[PDB]
Design a protein around this nucleic acid. Structure first.
Lengths: 103, 151, 63, 137, 100, 184
RNA sequence: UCCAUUGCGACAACGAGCGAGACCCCGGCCGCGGGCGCCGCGGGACGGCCCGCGGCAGCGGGAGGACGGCGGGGCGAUAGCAGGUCUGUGAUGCCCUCAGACGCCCUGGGCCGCACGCGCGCUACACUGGCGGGGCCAGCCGGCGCCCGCCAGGACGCGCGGAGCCCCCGCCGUGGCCGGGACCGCGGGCUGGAACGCCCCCGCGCACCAGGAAUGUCUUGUAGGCGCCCGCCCCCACCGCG
């Protein structure tokens, strides 16, 4: 969806925020989109747009983090986008660190 | 050689009361104990005649500390596989000690006999936990590393 | 003068900036039983008996 | 059993004299001047080595029992390192012909019988091996 | 009739293979299906340098594909076990093969 | 217990009351091959048969690393060659050799800016250096000579036990101690 | 205080989050179930106990216990490098090229040359060793037989299977010697379409007798010694990964 928006020439912040809200409404505790490449410049930047809480390391990254990589193509040159979505409640398993405790 | 199910494959039945396992450095010994005349056999060979001629006393060491009379009246068939010669001499002394102790079982005499062995040599009746460590990339050795050419 | 043995009463600490010197208070095992402090190399512990070559020389207290 | 009760070396040496006295094997004398194993470099200095190797090979086939080990397997039992090269040394099998000659004599002698795949010790040969062992004891 | 049909279950994931085991044992328990014979795991391994180029201290990614295989023994009528295959829970990406 | 099925530990008591605690004959087992972990714990090393420590010191230089079976064979032949000449218990002659080969004074900087000062060698270090020096003098002596390792090891022990300066180990002790007396 | 913003006691801060830990793979120990094959599911260990010391967090021991205080790995914060890869890629901007091609093939040859400087390694410098027979010991994981050939290797078949070191007895015996095995002349094989590749047999017998100034790795199953497998691969490892 983000790749299409970027090819529709949506602003990178506008396109990324739209993807973030849809994931957050679907209940991801954190959504992070990183767009990297020559963003309207001959120098290369790496603007990362992130909201919520996203885990970074451990076996839970395999279970609770959906990491998707695209290579959207623009006229100036390839703009690679990574969308990372983390859901602690995926039904099948629980976060090891989280302790549910009791009343 | 690797913890295979081949206990009865060497010998069929023979009223082997116990089937102990003694393991040192990837070498396992299944020892079968029945009433006998004090004979002990390892790998279908007399225990006294063992390959490391220098370490042939280590194999007979549990018999000496416990006493020949207690050993008399037992026949042990030991099959050692895996590991190497010195560990196979350590595995059989451990297997003999565990198996002879099994005859006393939960008795107060066993508690004394376990203590008697544990005093002369501890870990004679207790497995040694040390096991080989893996090679890691950038070193020929498990922990050794390649020589740094610069810096 | 033959060396006189002395037993460690307290292991004061690790010195020489590489830790290899150990500071120990040693009470002469026999004789006047003076409690002097002497530098030691190696592994040392309480009740270790070491023969002091001169014993009339003592390291700075807890230094 | 028996061949185990007598140390392996004290049996092999006595059996070598026995297998030269009874006329068993009979050295080819063409393999007498050959060196067993590509691995070695200077050839056996024993001069009665064929008989020691012959008594050792029957003793192996006896402990094998119905395993029926092959001649190539016996060559891997006499494998050693090929030392004397700048490249690091590795294990190299023994000469197949020498062992093949030894097993051939036993089959003709009927000390060892032929079997599916490798040959194995015959009952008639086993009788000779165990009587010798108990006699040494 | 009465022949012996060898079922072999080859699966990459242990929990998935254990589930196939539960269904196969349950369907054939009446037909005297044998308890699972677990094969030594096939830990096929590829170790590759992490870098596309040769730059940096050479690092290595140790990838292991473990394949878990269960052999099953049932002796009975062939038609019943053909239906038994439909009855057992179907696990996607996990394969069963029958050899007489 | 008769080490090498020939020598008891009954008369083997160390006279040096400073070094007696760190030399142990109680744990002796015929054939010095106990696989007990001496590396574990700061002072578990002390509670080890002295003869086993010598058998661990003998296997050095890399070309001979790990071959305990060959080292303990040498210890037995060396002990027989000590029994043959000294005419005394060879476990007891080793105990006297370890006691003498150990220097009591060393030189270390002591928080100085290269200026070494006098220190006192610990009673465990005295035992560890003493055995190491015995084995290293023999090692150097047999490197290019028809004389076997067993013969030179037998002779350093026989020389150390009296205190003869021919022992590479006693010369080392007197050098270490003298540098310590001057740096005092 | 801790391996650690690891905690505790505080505190214009008050609540969070990421990394740390947890997690994951393996190992060792014990149950249960299964079994062509040891392989599936659980437990066990937590600084819990004891003694001292510490508001505390913990600390030093003693124990019991396969196992003791980060057992070894996998994963890897935040912000960057103008580090490297366009020759891994129907990844790719732009420039060049674009039928006398920078497409794609085909034969031959190079990359492997070499006054030399340097970085990994390998084998030695011997007697704790070399050389002859004999015993014989694994693990990642794994086919064999028979006959011929000095081996190398081959033919013809089939359904299978296993190390060095070390131990034991001889020999040489301090001699650049039988240490060492570089070179170099015939010869025997192999693989492929083709050697210049590899293997092997009798020669041949180099330095090196322990390495200056420097410098590197390592605390238990570790160093080191000693084999073995796999990756690439017609053949080929002094390499890497196990």
């Amino acid at each position: 969806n983000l790749r299409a928006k970027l090819e529709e020439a949506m602003p990178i912040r506008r396109a990324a925020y739209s993807i973030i809200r849809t994931a957050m409404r679907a209940g991801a505790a954190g959504c992070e989109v990183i767009v990297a490449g020559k963003l309207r410049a001959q120098r290369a930047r790496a603007n990362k747009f992130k909201e919520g809480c996203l885990i970074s390391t451990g076996h839970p990254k395999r279970i609770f983090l959906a990491e998707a990589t695209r290579h959207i193509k623009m006229r100036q040159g390839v703009i690679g986008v990574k969308v990372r979505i983390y859901n602690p409640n995926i039904r099948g398993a629980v976060m090891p660190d989280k302790i549910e405790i009791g009343a | 050689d690797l913890l295979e199910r081949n206990d009865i494959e060497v010998r069929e039945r023979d009223k082997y009361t116990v089937h102990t396992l003694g393991k040192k450095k990837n070498s396992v010994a299944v020892a079968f104990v029945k009433a006998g005349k004090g004979d002990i056999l390892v790998n279908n060979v007399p225990l006294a005649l063992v390959r490391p001629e220098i370490l042939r006393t280590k194999v007979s060491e549990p018999i000496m500390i416990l006493g020949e009379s207690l050993f008399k009246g037992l026949d042990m068939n030991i099959k050692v596989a895996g590991g190497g010669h010195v560990s196979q001499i350590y595995a059989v002394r451990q297997a003999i000690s565990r198996g002879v102790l099994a005859s006393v079982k939960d008795e107060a005499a066993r508690s004394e006999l376990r203590a008697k062995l544990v005093s002369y040599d501890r870990q004679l009746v207790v497995s040694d936990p040390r096991r080989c460590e893996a090679k890691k990339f950038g070193g020929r050795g498990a922990r050794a590393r390649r020589q740094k050419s610069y810096r | 003068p033959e060396p006189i043995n002395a037993r460690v009463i307290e292991v004061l600490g690790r010195t020489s900036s590489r830790g290899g010197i150990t500071q120990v208070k040693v009470e002469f095992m026999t004789g006047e039983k003076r409690q002097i402090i002497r530098n030691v190399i190696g592994p040392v512990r309480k009740d270790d008996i070491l023969v002091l070559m001169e014993s009339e020389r003592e390291a700075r207290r807890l230094r | 059993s028996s061949v185990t009760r007598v140390p392996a070396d004290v049996f092999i040496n006595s059996f070598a004299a026995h297998l030269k006295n009874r006329g068993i094997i009979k050295c080819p004398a063409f393999t007498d001047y050959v060196k067993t194993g590509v691995s070695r470099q200077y050839a056996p200095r024993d001069a009665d080595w064929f008989y020691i190797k012959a008594a050792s090979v029957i003793r192996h086939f006896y402990i094998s029992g119905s395993h029926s080990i092959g001649v190539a397997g016996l060559a891997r039992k006499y494998s050693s390192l090929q030392k004397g090269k700048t490249t690091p040394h590795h294990t190299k099998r023994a000469s197949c012909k020498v062992i093949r000659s030894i097993v051939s004599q036993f089959l003709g002698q009927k000390l060892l019988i032929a079997g599916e795949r490798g040959r194995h010790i015959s009952p008639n040969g086993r009788k000779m091996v165990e009587d010798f062992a108990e006699g040494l004891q | 009739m009465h022949q012996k049909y060898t079922i072999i279950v080859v699966g990459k994931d242990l929990k998935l293979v254990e589930r196939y085991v539960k269904s196969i044992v349950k369907e054939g328990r009446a037909f005297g299906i044998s308890g699972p014979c677990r094969a030594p795991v096939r830990r096929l391994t590829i170790t590759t340098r992490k870098s596309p180029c040769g730059e940096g201290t050479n690092t290595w990614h140790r990838f292991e594909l473990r394949m878990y295989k269960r052999t099953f023994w049932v002796t009975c009528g062939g038609n019943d076990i053909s239906t038994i295959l439909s009855k057992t829970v179907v696990i996607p990406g996990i394969q069963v093969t029958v050899e007489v | 217990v008769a080490l090498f099925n020939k020598w008891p530990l009954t008369d083997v008591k160390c006279q040096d009351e400073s070094l007696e605690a760190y030399i142990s004959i109680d744990n002796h087992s015929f054939v010095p091959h106990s696989a007990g972990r001496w590396s574990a714990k700061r002072f578990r090393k002390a509670k080890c048969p002295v003869v086993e420590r010598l058998t661990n010191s003998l296997m050095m230089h890399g070309r001979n690393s790990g071959k305990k079976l060959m080292a303990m064979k040498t210890v037995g032949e060396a002990f027989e060659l000590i029994n043959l000449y000294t005419g005394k218990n060879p476990v007891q002659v080793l105990v006297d050799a370890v006691a003498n080969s150990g220097p009591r004074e060393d030189s270390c900087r002591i928080g100085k800016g290269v200026r070494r000062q006098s220190v006192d060698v610990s009673p465990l270090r005295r035992v560890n250096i003493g055995i190491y020096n015995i084995a290293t003098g023999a090692r150097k002596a047999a490197f290019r000579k028809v004389r076997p390792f067993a013969e030179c090891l037998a002779e350093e022990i026989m020389n150390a036990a009296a205190g003869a300066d021919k022992s590479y180990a006693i010369s080392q002790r007197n050098s270490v101690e003298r540098i310590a007396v001057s740096n005092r």
